[PDB]
A paper describes a structure:
Photolyases repair UV damage to DNA by using absorbed blue light. Within the photolyase/cryptochrome superfamily (PCSf), a major subgroup consists of prokaryotic (6–4) photolyases. These enzymes rely on flavin adenine dinucleotide (FAD) as a catalytic cofactor, besides an ancillary antenna chromophore, and a [4Fe-4S] cluster with yet unknown function. For the prokaryotic 6–4 photolyase of Caulobacter crescentus, we investigated structural changes associated with its different redox states by damage-free crystallography using X-ray free-electron lasers.
Numbering used by the authors: 1 to 508
Amino acid sequence: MAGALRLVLGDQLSDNLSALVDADLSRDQVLMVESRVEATAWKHHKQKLVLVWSAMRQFAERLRARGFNVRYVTLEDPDNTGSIGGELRRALEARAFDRVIRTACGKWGLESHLLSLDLPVPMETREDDRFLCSRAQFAAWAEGRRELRMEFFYREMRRKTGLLMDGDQPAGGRWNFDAENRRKLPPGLRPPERLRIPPNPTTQTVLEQVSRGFDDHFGEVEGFGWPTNPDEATAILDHFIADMLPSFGDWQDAMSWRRPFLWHSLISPALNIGLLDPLDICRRAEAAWREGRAPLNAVEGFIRQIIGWREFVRGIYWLKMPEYAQRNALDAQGKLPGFYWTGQTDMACVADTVRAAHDHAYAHHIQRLMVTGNLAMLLGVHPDAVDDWYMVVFADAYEWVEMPNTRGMATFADGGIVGSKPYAASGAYIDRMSDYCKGCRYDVKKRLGDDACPFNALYWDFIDRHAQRLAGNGRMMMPLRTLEKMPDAEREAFRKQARALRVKMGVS
Ligand SMILES: Cc1cc2nc3c(=O)[nH]c(=O)nc-3n(C[C@H](O)[C@H](O)[C@H](O)COP(=O)(O)OP(=O)(O)OC[C@H]3O[C@@H](n4cnc5c(N)ncnc54)[C@H](O)[C@@H]3O)c2cc1C
Ligand SMILES: Cc1nc2c(=O)[nH]c(=O)nc-2n(C[C@H](O)[C@H](O)[C@H](O)CO)c1C
Ligand code: SF4
């Protein structure tokens, strides 16, 4: 009875973490490591580093206040080996333990590494039951399904959680209340001001250290306003539930120039490191509808993103890795344009997405999908390069969620496992859902010439290039019919325009 060494990683900052269950506070030790391996696996946004390390230090203090013995290895510690495995070994050398207990993590490569570590004591790995669907449950649901579709997974998660269920039937008599025909904000409507969290003293200290120590990483650290502990994160959630959730269903796919948050919740960076709980979030939204403070379409749309999409992508990741990370179904080989890093492009929609990534480490979903994701797919950027960008620039990015949304939904590099069709779109889509195109120097009605919106020739070149395959996919009938009715000279024209754009943008 020497006790257990309990590992807590930077995205595991929850009192209810399975590795902390049944802790013997008089014998056990919690290990937390500020890891340069993890901090450089991708060159994470400076604000992601601030968030994780500020949240970790505060979580350690919360554990100590509850009686835990915490071995906390900081970035400045000259004996820190830099890695989780190295620090495990060193912790085990410092005092006697009977075993290591940890919670399976959110990156296949680290999980595979930790599972094969040869340590002097046994290492027990527990599932991360903060998620609503276990890895085993997803595998069992997916078995024998020719295609994995969120629509059907979501119904299963509604029945299992009981969220928005009146007995055995969905509230309102339908599962999903998504509406077609949603469009951009009306000219006069101004998105409301959003609550941000001024840095607390711990966060300020970490801000100063990241500013000095990681200046080469992407992004601005000034203005950091993300919540870094459960009190701050609940404040963000409270604001969303009371002030934004009633409007959540009107504007989920709209874009407004330099209004980067609209009515979104801004909870993903906190949720993905454990500062909020998925079930609790959804129950709070359900209560808003039950009690007459929000309409059902809004609340259902919100809950579907958390118990549906979030759990579905996690399921696909662990079911399909490691091969998933290698898939390149459209044989994309291009380089990522420099403007993905600098924002220096005349494409107003792209420039605004990069602006928000740089300044806030955030862009909302339809920008990630239909602006920068769609563009990378149409350009034929190699999926490794695309995954790298999405991992670096957003404060909510962890591989389990980034990769199926990026390699899958946004770029079809997975051949449709997540998304069932490429989300390709011309500039017409961005024009219908945003206020970007009028102020953009490009003409969204033109396909050819130096004034043409690049998305237009790129879209048709993409449909053309992959025409044989997309006609088999099944769900692209309208674009292929339009392509077919085009005379040959018109097709050759947009092929040449797209070739030019790929040279101009530094792709290929
Ligand atoms: C190419 C691309 C890459 C993405 N990379 C990430 C990533 O690294 N991390 C991440 O957490 N999300 C990722 N997303 C999903 C989604 O864009 C973000 O979760 C969302 O923008 C976060 O903003 P929010 O907290 O304001 O969410 P809201 O719009 O308020 O939505 C509520 C919550 O639903 C969840 N959610 C919504 N859509 C998804 C989805 N598609 N997948 C998973 N959870 C979702 C999040 O928990 C989010 O907080 C990606 C989407 C795309 C298309
Ligand atoms: C920047 C960063 N730093 C750390 C760290 O210092 N220590 C740690 O234990 N985890 C860190 N993380 C999170 C991991 O890199 C990784 O994304 C998660 O552990 C996946 O579950 C991140 C993202
Ligand atoms: S015209 Fe094209 S490039 Fe410019 S904002 Fe519209 S969609 Fe984006």
